[PDB]
Design a protein around this nucleic acid. Structure first.
Ligand SMILES: [Mg+2]
Length: 119
RNA sequence: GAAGCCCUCACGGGCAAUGUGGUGUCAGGGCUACCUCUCAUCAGCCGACCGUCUCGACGAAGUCUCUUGGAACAGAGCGUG
């Protein structure tokens, strides 16, 4: 909400999550805000996911701007538990980072484009 | 970075990426490359002596003489541990 500056259409979110699932199987993904943060910092991040139902918002507030000054692309997900499930967790997750896609580097790269365009 | 914890005989359930658990805590630590090594620390097993306080068992040698007296545990005499 305070860290969310644009709205992601339901359909776009689906493609993104789908991509994430194939990312855990084919490529590599980091689950958890701390682990995600280090990707953006270490630059190993290609696409980071951030839930919008996070409370306290503090836990994620930094993701956006941090990602911006690191060139890393990021997309918003409405449900915290969907991102967790999509990441392959039995629990939810406030943030995830696709650290080098897998059999999705295409669809992924394009999701990043759609978002950049979503302003 | 799920390698973790709680309940339950089990099955099963619950917690946990908003981080369980590993590492680590100024002889600073981590990371990378090395040297040597462990006897530090931490976790868990076992598990007292002595002392002190109280309680209890066992535990030596006269119940002799005369006098006074209601009564000798007194006086005088003899004897014992
Ligand atoms: Mg520890």
């Amino acid at each position: 909400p305070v860290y969310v500056d644009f709205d992601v259409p339901a359909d776009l979110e689906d493609d993104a999550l789908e991509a994430l699932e194939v990312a855990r199987d084919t490529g590599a993904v980091k689950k958890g805000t701390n682990e995600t943060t280090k990707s953006i910092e270490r630059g190993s991040a290609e696409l980071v996911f951030v839930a919008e139902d996070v409370q306290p918002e503090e836990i994620v507030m930094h993701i956006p701007e941090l990602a911006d000054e690191k060139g890393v692309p990021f997309i918003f997900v409405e449900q915290q538990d969907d991102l967790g499930h999509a990441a392959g967790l039995e629990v939810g997750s406030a943030a995830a980072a696709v650290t080098d896609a897998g059999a999705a580097a295409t669809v992924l790269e394009e999701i990043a484009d759609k978002v950049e365009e979503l302003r």
